[PDB]
Symmetry: C7
Subunit: 175 residues, 7 copies
């Protein structure tokens, strides 16, 4: 028992121009997501693309690959948080086109990074990655580096409204 | 190991009947699957009822809340049906059905008590577990019409309800033995 | 090596309106049996449905889900025991339509419940007992035996012959060839 | 191993009305064999069915499920022992239509049952004896040997040659080349 | 794993009437080989059947199953040893139709049996199987039982020419005629 | 779930003349990449081929197999670093056609090799020297610069990769 | 990996008469390679076959199985070393048709055998018999003396393509399409 067929449902979502990041982020997810984003831009570089995010996070470099692809394509991107968006998941959520970042009412949003890496790396390198995340979160939340760094220190989740206040998303909708 | 074929694919057939199955433990991939089916069925007709079959011991809370938010999101009425059991997040989805359209078979077991803990994708702090718990208190109260204190006390009891008890408590609306007609 | 093709045999059985409970019972089996039963009722709610049972038991709640579905649908249900029907398997066997519960001559039938899968999640003493009582009532309903008779019999760790099962009220007919 | 294609080689064998019981016998093998036997009966309830046996034995109840099915259907059944027919395997071999039970020349036949298990769930001492006595009666029925003879023979932990199995009543003919 | 398509390589060999015993021998291999042999006979009980052998051996009863099917069918059977034919593998190689048992130049051939298979069996039984192997080898090589028993006692491989002298095969070929 | 269908998604990329080196490099990855490179050349020995690299590295000989095929085929090869190009990954990135080596803004490049198929000390060193020569050929740095730089256990940004000669362009938008 | 489709990549290579030996060699690989070689011979007895070799070695008897098939078929065989050709891999590389044995510039070639390979454990005399067969094969195709082969295979080392050329393992090292 695996995937149903419709009048494949995940292919159906791709016809809707929906890209799913609904799990832990690794290099395989990144490749699949990136391949889909470039394909949808080709079908149309003006029509919006929709990203469904239900991820606890994952590999940083895998997440930044998706982010860079989101920034590369010309399409407006509507991000949708369902379930949760934690760590790199919340970075992709905040990277949506301004005005088009949404969450469902009961989602949980976390920008705190966990205590991840394809290979072992040095202290100076984890900190360079961390600082890249600070700049991206700052860019898209309109918050200063300081309040980003301090907020990412708190090991906690935000509600959709808190995330809206903080600048991670724009709209919280029930229907 | 083989999923039989009909006059094609039994589970594709249920989906043509607008039937979605939550028939096991709930995790992120189940939620991904259910959610996609609900949004698909809505697009075929946003007024025609959808039916959700629930035989689940529970699972990941955020995955269950993902399904719950999608249930409340779509315009369709939703009939929930409990066969076997609806425990933990399973009973939440059962109680989240359209009022008057929440059913159980006669011998099912319903539990709103949450398990002591794999209801998390990643380990979390004490304060977050409590925020999630209160989210559940509010949802059970919203759909059962019981007060917070009644829900909080009831969820502290490690027990299952019978369908008739679940009906009196406001979790479901009718217990069926045979089809009306 | 795995499942030939008729000119799929299990899909052929489903054309015959045959449903298979041929292994241990869990939520996955229950979901598949239930989907088939409802599908067959829609093709026709009067044509008999046939359930083949060769099972050592399984999850109680999953077995009750099948049982409830059997009782829900309009179709008459012929139950056939090949090999054995143990624990929840004998409950489904006994739940067939009166006069339509069968067994092959050398099958083994046990209504004794094993000690201690059994449940999907761990449960309290009171819950295990409430499940046991649901079995008592079902067995009493379809065998026409009193509760005390059921409770005492289910306390014996033994198997029955098809004949003993007929005398006890679990099945109606024991057959060697097409009756 | 990956089956080739001519259409699948095993679906081709089913068109020839050949059912294979190769390897150990469990509930899944039984459900499959039974389904094939009932299917072949429907295609023609008089045409012989052929059963190839290369098995070391297996679950008793599963073996009896196949056996009862063999006795249920109308069709004649030819049994062919290739390699070995041990324990429940030799019971299916011996349950073929009288006169249509065969073996290749170098096969090994054993009616002795294996110690311990053969069982889907653990069982009491009285039940295992009940099942054992069922096997005595089946072997007695088709070999035309007495219960005492069967009980004593199954106590010996040994195999038979095809000709010993013929003289004992398990099979009817040992073939080296295609009969004409 | 990644089996290429030819406008299925292993089904192409079956069209050529080639059966493969290309690994260790167990009941599943025997079911397949036997099914293919009977299929090929039915398409023609006169045309030769070819058996490619690169096997280290395996289950005795499984190997005897194939052997019996080889002797059963009417077709002449050409056996071909590529790589190695050890234990039951060498028996199948030797069971080929007289004059049609071949090997490539660098193959290794062993009639020595390895020191469980099938199920746990008694001492008398394993000896009965061993005696069945002696007789088979003695039939197809034309050696006496004494010669067979002593040769199977040596833990060693033969070259194709040694196996030719011994009677296990008839032709050692480098290239086609 | 597995891969989606469009009209498979990676077969679509191949129709675009895109080859993916999107994970750790091993022999199986090498044989697949190689076959796609030779196939694309047959389709056309003149149309650019694009290589997407998100790799932490892998087997050296496997990576050199890919590198040699890149240098063999006549096509211009455009390399694109997304996420990271580390160890052999950064070598294939630098092996692109001059002027056609790219990276997205937040990628990480590392030419340091990892400390680690059961070979002798002389052979590990022979292999390392081959990497030096290759990096020196395509970055236009001298060997001493390559050897000292590969000693540092660090990652480069795309911009320092550019000034070092690993890539040519850092793109943000089309 | 997930094999892509073109309008299967490895079946496209086989239509080019390319057979791949791109990993460790075992009876499974040999069975497949042999089947491909005999199929391509029937497509044309004389058209060259191409063999891509990126292998660390494998079972000796499996390797000799492929080698015997290579010498059996009438087709000329072009060998192409990419990545590496170690132990039995280098034997297959060296077994190509004289003048048609190739390597890319950065490949590594090793004729030294490993110490551990064995379908079934064997005696000491047998493993030396096999070793002698490898000696004779390498001698035949490199045109070196047995003594030269025996000494070289002691040295636990890899050769460069140009060093394999002057030893007689291959004939051409090329960078771009000739
Ligand atoms: C039409 C189509 C369909 C599927 C995928 C791609 C395309 C078109 N298409 C591209 O989108 C790009 C390139 N390219 C080459 C030939 N066709 C295409 C070259 C690289 N470029 C930059 C890039 C790389 C990775 C991530 C983000 C951005 C994008
Ligand atoms: C027609 C169809 C078929 C299958 C799937 C989707 C659709 C249509 N369709 C949507 O239903 C939604 C969006 N969208 C964008 C393009 N097409 C669609 C965007 C937002 N999304 C909100 C959402 C997400 C998860 C759970 C609940 C609600 C709904
Ligand atoms: C036509 C068809 C085909 C396949 C499967 C079902 C159907 C028809 N069909 C039903 O049988 C039922 C419902 N339903 C909704 C749309 N179609 C159907 C909803 C309620 N359900 C009650 C039930 C649930 C579980 C177990 C037992 C009984 C029965
Ligand atoms: C025509 C056909 C094709 C495939 C499978 C079955 C059939 C016909 N067919 C039966 O053979 C039987 C029943 N049945 C009901 C509708 N069709 C059929 C019901 C009872 N069953 C008894 C039995 C069961 C298992 C083992 C041995 C004997 C036989
Ligand atoms: C036409 C065909 C196609 C595939 C497979 C077989 C056949 C023909 N065919 C047989 O060859 C045999 C039987 N049989 C029955 C219907 N068709 C066939 C029954 C007896 N069996 C004897 C045997 C068994 C095992 C090994 C050796 C010999 C041979
Ligand atoms: C047309 C096509 C399609 C797929 C693959 C190849 C081809 C054409 N094609 C070649 O490209 C090459 C050879 N060859 C033989 C028949 N067809 C082809 C032989 C030698 N090989 C050299 C090589 C090998 C590995 C890596 C790099 C270079 C190139
Ligand atoms: C046309 C074709 C296609 C695929 C496979 C084979 C053939 C043709 N074909 C043979 O090549 C051979 C035989 N044979 C019989 C019927 N067809 C064929 C018999 C002997 N075999 C010897 C051999 C075995 C292994 C390796 C090398 C040589 C060669």
């Amino acid at each position: 028992s695996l995937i149903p067929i419709v009048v494949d449902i995940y292919s159906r979502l791709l016809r809707e121009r929906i890209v799913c990041v609904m799990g832990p982020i690794d290099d395989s997810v990144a490749s699949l997501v990136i391949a889909q984003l470039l394909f949808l831009q080709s079908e149309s570089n003006k029509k919006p693309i929709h990203m469904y995010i239900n991820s606890p996070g994952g590999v940083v470099t895998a997440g930044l690959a998706i982010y860079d692809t989101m920034q590369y394509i010309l399409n407006p991107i509507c991000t949708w948080c369902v379930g949760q968006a934690a760590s790199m998941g919340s970075l992709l959520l905040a990277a949506g086109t301004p005005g088009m970042r949404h969450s469902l009412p009961n989602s949980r949003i976390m920008i705190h990074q966990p205590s991840a890496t394809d290979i072992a790396i040095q202290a100076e390198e984890i900190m360079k990655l961390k600082k890249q995340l600070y700049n991206i979160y700052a860019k898209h939340t309109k918050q200063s580096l300081q309040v980003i760094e301090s907020a990412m220190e708190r090991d906690r989740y935000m509600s959709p409204m808190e995330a809206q206040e903080f600048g991670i998303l724009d709209k919280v909708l029930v229907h």
